[PDB]
C-alpha cells in the first residue's frame, strides 16, 4: 500500500535519488530556468524551495547548512546574496512549473521549472 | 428504527474514575435534515430520505438542486434512506440531531472499509505460506492447488483467490454508546469502526438487541 506516503522513488535508490536532486537543485539556482521531466520537476520543488527559505536569514550556521545540502559554494553564495533577498517578501511558491510537451527520445512528459522572479 | 449519518472524526481514549480506559471512535453527527418521505401508497414502502452536512453550490447539479428545493432544505454531502417501523413518522424538512441516540445503548455502525487494493491470498484469505526454504522454488506464498483433477475438471464458484480487498461496505454490530454530546454533535462508540478518518458513516440502533 501507499496510504498517505510522500516522495517519488523515480526508479532509483535512495543514494542516487538524493544526489540527483542535489545536482538538479544547483542547476536551477545557477540557471534560473531548466527543462526536466514533469514528475522530476514536481519533486524538485520540495528540495529547492526549502533552500531558498533557508537563505532568507543570512548566518554562518545557515550557510554551512546550505552547503551541506548543495556542496557548492557558488550555489550557496547565489542563494544568500541574490535569491534570498529577492524572495524575502514571498511566503513560499518561489518556483513555477510549465508543461512543454513530450520528449522525442522516449515520449517522456517534459516541463520547464523556473523561479517566479525571472522577469528582467 | 431510524438512524443517522455521521463522519468519522477519529479514534480517542476515554478515562473513567474506576481506572478503566475505553477506546472510543469519535463520530460527528450534524443535523440530519429529511429531504423526502417514502409512502406505501406512492413508493410501496415506508422510508425517509435525509441529507447531512453541506456542499458548495457551485458543484450542485440542477437536478440535485431541485430535489433539495422541493423540501426547502440546503444541499448536503449526499442522500441516504432509513426504513420506518409502524410507529415512526416524519415530515419533509424536519431536522434530526444526535439526541436520537440519547437513550440508545447499542448501535450498529456501517461504512466503507479501507482500500487495500489488489491483495494476495495470504493477506486476503489468511492462506498459509509454503516453506521459505527446503527446496521451495518460486512458490513461497502462491495459492497452491485449486482443484481436484479430471473428475471435476474445473474450478468451483467461490474459490478463494487474489483480488480486490477492502473498499467495500462493512457493518460492525453491537457497539456500546459511551457518550452522546448533543451540544457538540458528537457520538462516542466503544471500539473501532470501518473506514478512514473523514469517511461517511451510518449509525443505527443495534438490530441484534
Amino acid at each position: 500500500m501507499r496510504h498517505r506516503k510522500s516522495g517519488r522513488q523515480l526508479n532509483r535508490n535512495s543514494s542516487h535519488r538524493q544526489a540527483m536532486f542535489r545536482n538538479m537543485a544547483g542547476s536551477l539556482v545557477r540557471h534560473e530556468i531548466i527543462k526536466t521531466t514533469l514528475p522530476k520537476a514536481k519533486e524538485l520543488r520540495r528540495v529547492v524551495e526549502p533552500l531558498i527559505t533557508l537563505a532568507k536569514t543570512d548566518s554562518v550556521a545557515n550557510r554551512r547548512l546550505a552547503f551541506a545540502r548543495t556542496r557548492d559554494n557558488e550555489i550557496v553564495a547565489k542563494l544568500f546574496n541574490e535569491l534570498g533577498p529577492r524572495f524575502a517578501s514571498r511566503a513560499g511558491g518561489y518556483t513555477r512549473i510549465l508543461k512543454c510537451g513530450f520528449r522525442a527520445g522516449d515520449n517522456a512528459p517534459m516541463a520547464y521549472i523556473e523561479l517566479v522572479d525571472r522577469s528582467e | 428504527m431510524i438512524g443517522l449519518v455521521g463522519k468519522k472524526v477519529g479514534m480517542t481514549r476515554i478515562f473513567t474514575e474506576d481506572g478503566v480506559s475505553i477506546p472510543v471512535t469519535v463520530i460527528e453527527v450534524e443535523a440530519n435534515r429529511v429531504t423526502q418521505v417514502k409512502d406505501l401508497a406512492n413508493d410501496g414502502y415506508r422510508a425517509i430520505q435525509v441529507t447531512t452536512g453541506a456542499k458548495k453550490a457551485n458543484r450542485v447539479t440542477k437536478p440535485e438542486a431541485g430535489h433539495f428545493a422541493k423540501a426547502g432544505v440546503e444541499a448536503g454531502r449526499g442522500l441516504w434512506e432509513f426504513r420506518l417501523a409502524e410507529g415512526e413518522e416524519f415530515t419533509v424538512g424536519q431536522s434530526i440531531s444526535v439526541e436520537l441516540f440519547a437513550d440508545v445503548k447499542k448501535v450498529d455502525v456501517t461504512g466503507t472499509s479501507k482500500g487495500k487494493g489488489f491483495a494476495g491470498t495470504v493477506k486476503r484469505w489468511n492462506f498459509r505460506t509454503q516453506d521459505a526454504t527446503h527446496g521451495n522454488s518460486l512458490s513461497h506464498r502462491v495459492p497452491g492447488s485449486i482443484g481436484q483433477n479430471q473428475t471435476p475438471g474445473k474450478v468451483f464458484k467461490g474459490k478463494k483467490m487474489a483480488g480486490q480487498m477492502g473498499n467495500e461496505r462493512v457493518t460492525v454490530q453491537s457497539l456500546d454508546v459511551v457518550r452522546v454530546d448533543a451540544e457538540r454533535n458528537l457520538l462516542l462508540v466503544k471500539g473501532a469502526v470501518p473506514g478512514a478518518t473523514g469517511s461517511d458513516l451510518i449509525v443505527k440502533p443495534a438490530v441484534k438487541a
Binding site: - | 480517542t12 481514549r13 478515562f15 473513567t16 474506576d18 480506559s21 469519535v26 458528537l186
Partner: protein
C-alpha cells in the same frame, strides 16, 4: 482534529511534574483488594518517555527481589495517583533500553547536577 484535540484536553491531568529519562521517579498507583482502595509505590529509573498529549506514557525499570520489572504507565490515567522525582540522572539519550543488559555497577547513572 480540533474536535479530538479539545476532547482529550478536557481530561488531561494538570499536576504532571517535569521529569526526564534516567531520572529516578516514584509513582503512586491505586490498587484494589476487595472493597478497600490502596496506594502502592513503584520506584525506578525512567528509561523511556513518549509525549502524545492524553496518550503520553513513560516506562520505569526496577530490580525487585532479584527480578527486573518494567512498568509502562499511562501518564494521564486515573490509576496513577502522583509522580515524584526522587533523583535526577544525566544521560545522553532519550531511550535507555541499553540498561536492560546491565546490572549492579554497570547500571549506575550519573547525577544531573545542573
Amino acid at each position: 482534529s480540533n474536535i479530538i484535540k479539545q476532547l482529550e484536553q478536557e481530561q488531561m491531568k494538570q499536576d504532571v511534574p517535569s521529569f526526564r529519562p534516567g531520572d529516578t521517579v516514584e509513582v503512586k498507583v491505586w490498587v484494589v483488594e476487595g472493597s478497600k482502595k490502596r496506594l502502592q509505590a513503584f520506584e525506578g529509573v525512567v528509561i523511556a518517555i513518549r509525549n502524545r498529549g492524553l496518550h503520553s506514557a513513560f516506562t520505569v525499570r526496577k530490580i525487585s527481589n532479584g527480578e527486573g520489572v518494567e512498568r509502562v504507565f499511562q501518564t494521564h490515567s486515573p490509576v496513577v495517583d502522583s509522580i515524584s522525582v526522587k533523583r535526577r540522572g544525566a544521560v545522553r539519550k532519550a531511550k535507555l533500553y541499553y540498561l536492560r543488559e546491565r546490572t549492579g555497577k554497570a547500571a549506575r547513572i550519573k547525577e544531573r547536577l545542573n
